[PDB]
Structures are given as structure tokens and as C-alpha cells.
Amino acid sequence: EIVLTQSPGTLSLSPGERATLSCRASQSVSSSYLAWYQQKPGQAPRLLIYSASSRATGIPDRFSGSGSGTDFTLTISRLEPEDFAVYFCQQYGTSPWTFGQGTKVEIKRTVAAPSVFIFPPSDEQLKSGTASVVCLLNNFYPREAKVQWKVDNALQSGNSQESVTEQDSKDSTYSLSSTLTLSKADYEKHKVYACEVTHQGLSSPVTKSFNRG
Amino acid sequence: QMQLVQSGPEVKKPGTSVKVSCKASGFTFTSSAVQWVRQARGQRLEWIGWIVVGSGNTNYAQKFQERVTITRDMSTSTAYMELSSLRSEDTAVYYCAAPNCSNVVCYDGFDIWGQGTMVTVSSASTKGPSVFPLAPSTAALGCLVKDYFPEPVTVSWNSGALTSGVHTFPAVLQSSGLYSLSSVVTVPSSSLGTQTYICNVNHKPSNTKVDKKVEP
Amino acid sequence: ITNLCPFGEVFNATRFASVYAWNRKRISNCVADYSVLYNSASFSTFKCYGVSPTKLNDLCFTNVYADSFVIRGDEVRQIAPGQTGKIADYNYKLPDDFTGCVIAWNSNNLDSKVGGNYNYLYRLFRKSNLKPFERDISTEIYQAGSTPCNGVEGFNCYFPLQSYGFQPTNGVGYQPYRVVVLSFELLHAPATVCGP
Ligand SMILES: *[C@@H]1O[C@H](CO)[C@@H](O[C@@H]2O[C@H](CO)[C@@H](O[C@@H]3O[C@H](CO[C@H]4O[C@H](CO)[C@@H](O)[C@H](O)[C@@H]4O)[C@@H](O)[C@H](O[C@H]4O[C@H](CO)[C@@H](O)[C@H](O)[C@@H]4O)[C@@H]3O)[C@H](O)[C@H]2NC(C)=O)[C@H](O)[C@H]1NC(C)=O
Ligand SMILES: *[C@@H]1O[C@H](CO)[C@@H](O[C@@H]2O[C@H](CO)[C@@H](O[C@@H]3O[C@H](CO)[C@@H](O)[C@H](O)[C@@H]3O)[C@H](O)[C@H]2NC(C)=O)[C@H](O)[C@H]1NC(C)=O
Known part of the structure; x- marks a missing residue:
């Protein structure tokens, strides 16, 4: 052809x-x-x-x-x-x-480790339409970055959309974020919400979350 | 100087036609040709076909044999493109091309290019965005923008400045055809209990100018 | 009253020619009456460069050249001493200091058939302007670029000839107006076309 x-x-x-x-x-x-x-x-x-x-x-x-x-x-x-x-x-x-x-x-920047932290949904969401939760990944060079939703006793990918930024100039690293959508009904069906990530400069896998309380 | 001028953006609906104009200037348009390509959102380039301004020569791609007609026109020394029966997969960015030919000799390369129009087929339900706050608990925070009609949008911080880690992410098309994005900037240090944090947002294609403070 | 010359069949011919290949017919050794043409006729645009059409019969010249062709409707003012355009610069370069009068009558009854009448041709691409009284019956591929192209079509390599788009109801602006242009000659030779 x-x-x-x-x-x-x-x-x-x-x-x-x-x-x-x-x-x-x-x-x-x-x-x-x-x-x-x-x-x-x-x-x-x-x-x-x-x-x-x-x-x-x-x-x-x-x-x-x-x-x-x-x-x-x-x-x-x-x-x-x-x-x-x-x-x-x-x-x-x-x-x-x-x-x-x-x-x-x-360009290459001697591969530095990223930083992970999550934003819980706010009081503005429980009276709006849908309550979403977001994770943020910042300051990593390599594209190799897998994001997995650590749902309580569940590893599912029913609906999740990612976002990638262009290359930075001063710092020359990348950044990604994750978004999830879930039923407005009570959101309390599973009380544990977390997002995982694996990377070269991480050794043991990192897990960080915060149950409401 | 010699350049090429293209029309502005349009917003349409599934099942109509469009028209894009390439008003050539600064060079002999009579002996030249125009090539039409189609770029998607961060994807590979495509081809649509071409016409000779000397009239009487059209050659379309196989998959686009129908649905497109390249009218030429000569009174205003422009070029027109018409794509009919717009479908949801045709949301893309359209370009223009031509060789810089001057009388005796025609330059062999598509040197000059158009600014590029933009078309967006959707359900045509315009709506203003809604801002949601995010606060942390050496920290980062930002305000989320959601549920606005497919259209260009801008974000700011009352200054278009303060780039201490400001990150604006590309727009994302959700299930319902409504756009969304987010922006988070990290705080300087462990002095977030005082000073001012505001995440003002701006908009212009509609009558929406929303603002929201962010607090832990 | 001797014999005439076949101005009738020259004018009353069925199919004249295409513009890029115009014909000739040396006319001499008879009498001609350039009076019936203008005294009462339907030939519009009987422009008569050279000598005025009045008092034209008496003057006598050596030989008469007749040229015939078919062109567009609105594009008839370009065929004159001077003027520039797609025509008269690529197909029929009429020289300055011209002698003879031009006849250009409209016709929409023996041309532009029902549907699409695609039979006439005219040169569209040429590297240089035509010399005076020059006809270029050529079909070779035009070279509009800087790279040789061997009998192929593509970028910066096109076809010289193009077809007319006469349509039955396209409008009065674009109709096939059959045009016949004459000429004259007078040199060191006993003139023969002396028609009183
Ligand atoms: C190409 O072929 C055409 C077709 O044959 C030739 O045109 C014909 O020319 C002849 C003359 O050579 C014409 O014959 C004349 O017809 C007249 C009647 O037609 C007119 O009648 C109406 C009535 O209202 C007028 O309004 C209208 O204008 C018509 O034109 C006759 O009355 C004429 O007779 C008179 O003239 C002769 C000659 O001067 C006199 O001797 C008579 O006594 C009388 O006064 C004449 O017979 C014929 O009509 C034309 N055909 C047409 C117009 O279709 C072309 O001549 C030929 N090309 C060339 C170069 O010759
Ligand atoms: C498109 O093509 C045209 C013609 O092929 C280009 O125009 C040419 O541009 C060059 C670059 O400036 C001109 O060269 C300059 O000419 C002046 C004349 O005195 C000379 O003093 C300078 O030293 C320089 O050599 C050139 O003159 C000009 N052509 C003509 C006929 O004026 C044009 O640049 C092309 N466009 C692009 C975007 O490439």
C-alpha cells in the first residue's frame, strides 16, 4: 500500500x-x-x-x-x-x-521522582449534580506513569479521564491529573478512595489517601 | 509582505454544510494551486484534495470522493471549500496551502499556509461553566471549571500572572459533549493561613464572568 | 460583371474552427462588394479599423486574407490592435498598424447544444506571448515548475489546452459569438481585388 x-x-x-x-x-x-x-x-x-x-x-x-x-x-x-x-x-x-x-x-532531565496528593470533594458537590474526585501528579520527566483507582476492595476502570500538560520551560517536567465520575446517590457505598501510581524513581509503590472523618 | 488570509471559526450542527475561504494575496494567484488538509486534536495530518487555480482540475481522496466540492472562483482571487453532511467525527481544524509562484517560475513547495479555521459539531446546547473549589489539608490548590459549551475558554488570576506553579490543563470532552478542565497552582510554603488566595476566572463568548475564593 | 469570390460560404459555413487553430483563405482575382455586408445586415459590432466602412468599395488592394474562429461572448473587445488578456496574448496576437475590418456577429442557434456543448478549445498556458500573426497548434505538456515532467499531470506540470463551457442558458455574458476578421495586403504586384 x-x-x-x-x-x-x-x-x-x-x-x-x-x-x-x-x-x-x-x-x-x-x-x-x-x-x-x-x-x-x-x-x-x-x-x-x-x-x-x-x-x-x-x-x-x-x-x-x-x-x-x-x-x-x-x-x-x-x-x-x-x-x-x-x-x-x-x-x-x-x-x-x-x-x-x-x-x-x-530534552532529558536525569529522571526525577514525582509528587502525589489528592483533593477530596467539597461541600459544593453534595447539592450539585455529580460529585467528582481528582488526583494530581506533578514534576515527573518520563511519560511512563500508570494511574489506578484504588476503590475499596475494587480495582475498576469503568469511567476515568486523564489530562496531560505540555512540556514546561523553567522546570522541564510533566504533570498529569485524574478525574472520576460516580453516582450522586450517596457516594458512601465504598468509603475508601485512593489513586495509585508506579514509576522508575519510586522503589516501593506509593499509596496515599484519606477517608472522610 | 506576502501572506494568506483565512476565515474565522464556525459552530455547526450534525447534518449541514460549511464554507472556508482562502483569500490569497501578495503573489500571482492565477498560476498556483491550493491543498486542503485536516488536523485533529493532537493527531496525525490528513488530506482532502486540491484544485488548480487555472481551473479544471480536482482530485479528491478515496474516502472523501463525495461530501466535498472545491469551488475556485476568480473575481475576488480567493478559494472556497464546501464539506456537506457534517458528522460527529469531523470535529477538527482545517488548514490551507499554496506554492509561492511569481509569474515565470512556480516554487515547488507549499511554502505559505493559512491561519487555520475551526469547526465543532455538537448537540448545540450552549451553557455557562460552574466553578468548584479544591483546598488542601509545600501544598497545592486550585479551582475546577466544569460544564461549559464547546468553545474556547480562558483562565486567569486577576492578573494573567503569578506563575509560581500555575498549570492549566487541556480541555476534556465528557460523555454529554460538554467541555471541562482544571487548574491548580501550588502555594509558596507553610504560610497559607494568611495572605490572599483567589482563583478568579474569565470568559467572553457568553455573558459569564464568575469568581470564587478558595479556603482550607 | 465577371465572377465573384465565395464570401457567402466563408460566412455561411456550418462549423468554422476553434480559436487556437484559426484558418486562412487567400482571396484574389475577382471582384468583391464590401457593401452588402454593412448596408443592411444583422452583423452586430461591425467595427472597421483601418479605413472607415463608408466609401470602402472603390479602394483596391492586392490580396485579401480571411481568418475565422469562435470565442466567448463578453470577451470580444480584447481582439484589437493592442489590449492584453487571456486571449489576444496566447491565441491571436493582432499586430498594431492593422488594415482591414472585423465582423463579430452573435450566434446561439448553431452552437451551445442542449445540455453540455464541450467541443471547442483554447490555449490557457504558455511560457511567452505570441508573435504577430502566430498560431501555435501544439499539445505538448506545459512545464510550470523547475523539475522535468514526462507526459504526466501533477504539481507544477499542467495541460496547455482547456475546453469551453458553453451552456444553453448560461446567460448573455457567455455565448459563442462567431468572429470573422479580415485583412489586406498591397505590395509590388498588380492588385486584383478591385470590386466597384
Ligand atoms: C447566407 O445565407 C442567407 C440565407 O439565404 C443569406 O441571406 C439572404 O439574403 C437574401 C438577399 O441576398 C435575402 O433575400 C431578400 O429577402 C427579402 C424579404 O426578407 C425580408 O422580409 C421582411 C418583411 O418585413 C423584412 O422585415 C426582413 O428584413 C427580411 O429580411 C426580399 O424582400 C428581398 O428582395 C428585395 O431585394 C432584392 C435585392 O436587392 C431586390 O432586387 C428585390 O426587388 C427586393 O426589393 C431579398 O430577396 C434573404 O431574405 C436572406 N435570408 C435571410 C435574411 O434569412 C445571406 O446573404 C448569405 N450570406 C451571404 C454573405 O450572402
Ligand atoms: C515568494 O517569492 C518571491 C519571488 O520569488 C520572493 O520575493 C523575493 O524575496 C527576496 C528576499 O528578500 C528578495 O531579495 C531581495 O531583493 C532586493 C532587491 O533589490 C535585494 O536588494 C536584496 O538584497 C534581496 O536580494 C527578492 O527581490 C524578491 N523578489 C522580487 C521579484 O522582488 C518572496 O520572498 C517569497 N516569499 C517567501 C515567504 O519566501
Whole structure:
């Protein structure tokens, strides 16, 4: 078929890197109609390299990359700290002009441990529609973070939605939160509510909650 | 300078059509083409097709053979896109593209891009948000925003400042099609029994300007 | 009263031509009457650059060239000494210092059939403007970019010719107005078309 899968999932290296990106295609495309796009989150994409081996109107760091009929690559020597975004392949030699999956880049911050604490529902919720409970995870570098609802004698995932923030600048860590929905009826069917988490810099698993009283 | 201008956001209902305008300027529009893509919320890019401004050339994707017609127009030197029978899976962000061609030679790359419109198909039940407080018991706290219609929303702290750990989270679509989010900022230290903590919130597309204090 | 020349069948022909491939017919060695054409006829827009249509029969020239083609309705003022546009700059470059008068009569009875009449063609893409009295009957693929394209369609590589979109009820603005433009010549040769 006509696909544009890319070998690297994610990249994480501090400023200064060879930054080799592979865009292995499947069908034979003449190396005349192909382009690379960069999309800084929060705005429109920009064109970087067109026609495989060329450059745009103006590009810093001397972006370089060239390939063949069924193989292309892009490399960024001495990756500047400003340049950190998503890169998309694209081919327009023949219809359809299928795009690519895209890759992501990030910096490394010697993996620090996160902090966990929960917010119990307030007095404003028992007379409103639905009473929700939220947990907060802050200041962790790695994406590897599993959140499990430690319901009293129950490990269920009937309904739960997560939220992820973009990369911070000053602190360069991530943050996640969890939300749950439950029957308004009494909320006292199970009196124990907790959220678990496992991480690299944690050793023994951490469990922290507070029953009402 | 040479740029491209696109229309503004729209809000529609399941079972209607839309129109998006790409008013090209600053370059010879006659010898050029426009490509139309469709980005989702943090997902991969797609394709919709393209037309030649020289008239008489359309090429759509296989899955979008129907439901879309790319009219061109030439009097106002713009380009139009029409997508019909909008469905709930079509909630996305629409872009625009063109090569920077100037008379003799056409540039081979889609250098210029549009600002990007936005469409949101839903049950069309506009409602103002409600603010819920969260207080702790070296600490963090914040006020929760819930139950507002799909639309851009802003949060503040009476200053648009005080970034001592302020975290605003992306909007989340619940089961009923209503948006929600939250924001929590950690307190400086164990001096939260005095001084001022307020979590004022702002809004503009409706007549809602709500505020709430937070106390332990 | 001798013999005439077949101005009748030149005008009363069924199918004239397409605009990008216009025909010619050298007319000489007879008498011609440029009076029945203008004295009483339905030929609108009988513009007569060169010498005024009045007192035209008496003057005699060597040879007469007849050119015929079909163009759009509202796009008829562009065919004149000078002027620029999609026409008269890619298909029929009429030179300055022109001699001869132009006839352009409307017609919506032998053209624009019911439904879609897609048979006429006109050049749309060309790298440079036409030389005076130049016809380019070519079909080769236009190169609008910086990369060679070998008989294929795609980005920055298009097709030169395009088809007209005449419709039975599109409107008075866009109707096929059959246009016949004449010319003249006079050089070191005994003139023959002296029609009193
Ligand atoms: C292409 O083919 C067409 C079709 O044949 C030619 O047009 C014909 O031309 C002839 C003359 O050459 C026309 O014949 C004339 O018909 C008149 C009657 O028609 C008119 O009647 C109404 C009545 O109200 C008028 O309102 C209206 O304008 C009509 O036009 C006759 O009365 C004429 O006779 C008179 O003129 C002759 C010649 O001067 C005199 O000798 C007579 O005594 C008399 O006074 C004349 O016979 C014919 O009508 C035209 N056909 C049409 C218009 O459909 C084209 O000429 C030909 N192309 C070329 C280049 O020749
Ligand atoms: C879109 O394409 C056009 C034309 O291909 C680009 O315009 C060109 O822009 C360059 C960059 O500034 C101009 O170069 C400058 O020209 C002046 C003229 O004196 C010269 O003094 C400068 O030193 C510099 O070389 C160039 O002139 C201009 N083209 C024309 C015909 O004026 C345009 O930049 C392209 N847009 C984008 C976003 O790339």
C-alpha cells in the first residue's frame, strides 16, 4: 500500500545531537516530489525541506537530508535548543498525497521522582449534580506513569479521564491529573478512595489517601 | 509582505454544510494551486484534495470522493471549500496551502499556509461553566471549571500572572459533549493561613464572568 | 460583371474552427462588394479599423486574407490592435498598424447544444506571448515548475489546452459569438481585388 510510517517513536536528547530521523516509505516514489514539515504545537506547520535534497527560503542549523526511491532521511547536526517540535513527512508524487505519522523530540532531565496528593470533594458537590474526585501528579520527566483507582476492595476502570500538560520551560517536567465520575446517590457505598501510581524513581509503590472523618 | 488570509471559526450542527475561504494575496494567484488538509486534536495530518487555480482540475481522496466540492472562483482571487453532511467525527481544524509562484517560475513547495479555521459539531446546547473549589489539608490548590459549551475558554488570576506553579490543563470532552478542565497552582510554603488566595476566572463568548475564593 | 469570390460560404459555413487553430483563405482575382455586408445586415459590432466602412468599395488592394474562429461572448473587445488578456496574448496576437475590418456577429442557434456543448478549445498556458500573426497548434505538456515532467499531470506540470463551457442558458455574458476578421495586403504586384 501507500504508507509513510516513520521508524522513531520519540527522541529525547539534550541540546547537541546528530538527530537522525527515518521516514521509510513503502511504494516506489521518484525522489522529486517529497517535503518535510515542522509543526510547533499551537500554530500552523512550516515547510523545511522540499524536493528531497534542497532547502527552503531560509533555515538555520543547516538542516540536511537526502534519500532514494523507497527511503529518505533527515538529520539535524547540533540540535539547537529552540528547535523542539513535531516533524511530518509528506509525498505528492502521485495521488493520494498521504502524510506521515510524525515524531516528537524532547530534552532529558536525569529522571526525577514525582509528587502525589489528592483533593477530596467539597461541600459544593453534595447539592450539585455529580460529585467528582481528582488526583494530581506533578514534576515527573518520563511519560511512563500508570494511574489506578484504588476503590475499596475494587480495582475498576469503568469511567476515568486523564489530562496531560505540555512540556514546561523553567522546570522541564510533566504533570498529569485524574478525574472520576460516580453516582450522586450517596457516594458512601465504598468509603475508601485512593489513586495509585508506579514509576522508575519510586522503589516501593506509593499509596496515599484519606477517608472522610 | 506576502501572506494568506483565512476565515474565522464556525459552530455547526450534525447534518449541514460549511464554507472556508482562502483569500490569497501578495503573489500571482492565477498560476498556483491550493491543498486542503485536516488536523485533529493532537493527531496525525490528513488530506482532502486540491484544485488548480487555472481551473479544471480536482482530485479528491478515496474516502472523501463525495461530501466535498472545491469551488475556485476568480473575481475576488480567493478559494472556497464546501464539506456537506457534517458528522460527529469531523470535529477538527482545517488548514490551507499554496506554492509561492511569481509569474515565470512556480516554487515547488507549499511554502505559505493559512491561519487555520475551526469547526465543532455538537448537540448545540450552549451553557455557562460552574466553578468548584479544591483546598488542601509545600501544598497545592486550585479551582475546577466544569460544564461549559464547546468553545474556547480562558483562565486567569486577576492578573494573567503569578506563575509560581500555575498549570492549566487541556480541555476534556465528557460523555454529554460538554467541555471541562482544571487548574491548580501550588502555594509558596507553610504560610497559607494568611495572605490572599483567589482563583478568579474569565470568559467572553457568553455573558459569564464568575469568581470564587478558595479556603482550607 | 465577371465572377465573384465565395464570401457567402466563408460566412455561411456550418462549423468554422476553434480559436487556437484559426484558418486562412487567400482571396484574389475577382471582384468583391464590401457593401452588402454593412448596408443592411444583422452583423452586430461591425467595427472597421483601418479605413472607415463608408466609401470602402472603390479602394483596391492586392490580396485579401480571411481568418475565422469562435470565442466567448463578453470577451470580444480584447481582439484589437493592442489590449492584453487571456486571449489576444496566447491565441491571436493582432499586430498594431492593422488594415482591414472585423465582423463579430452573435450566434446561439448553431452552437451551445442542449445540455453540455464541450467541443471547442483554447490555449490557457504558455511560457511567452505570441508573435504577430502566430498560431501555435501544439499539445505538448506545459512545464510550470523547475523539475522535468514526462507526459504526466501533477504539481507544477499542467495541460496547455482547456475546453469551453458553453451552456444553453448560461446567460448573455457567455455565448459563442462567431468572429470573422479580415485583412489586406498591397505590395509590388498588380492588385486584383478591385470590386466597384
Ligand atoms: C447566407 O445565407 C442567407 C440565407 O439565404 C443569406 O441571406 C439572404 O439574403 C437574401 C438577399 O441576398 C435575402 O433575400 C431578400 O429577402 C427579402 C424579404 O426578407 C425580408 O422580409 C421582411 C418583411 O418585413 C423584412 O422585415 C426582413 O428584413 C427580411 O429580411 C426580399 O424582400 C428581398 O428582395 C428585395 O431585394 C432584392 C435585392 O436587392 C431586390 O432586387 C428585390 O426587388 C427586393 O426589393 C431579398 O430577396 C434573404 O431574405 C436572406 N435570408 C435571410 C435574411 O434569412 C445571406 O446573404 C448569405 N450570406 C451571404 C454573405 O450572402
Ligand atoms: C515568494 O517569492 C518571491 C519571488 O520569488 C520572493 O520575493 C523575493 O524575496 C527576496 C528576499 O528578500 C528578495 O531579495 C531581495 O531583493 C532586493 C532587491 O533589490 C535585494 O536588494 C536584496 O538584497 C534581496 O536580494 C527578492 O527581490 C524578491 N523578489 C522580487 C521579484 O522582488 C518572496 O520572498 C517569497 N516569499 C517567501 C515567504 O519566501
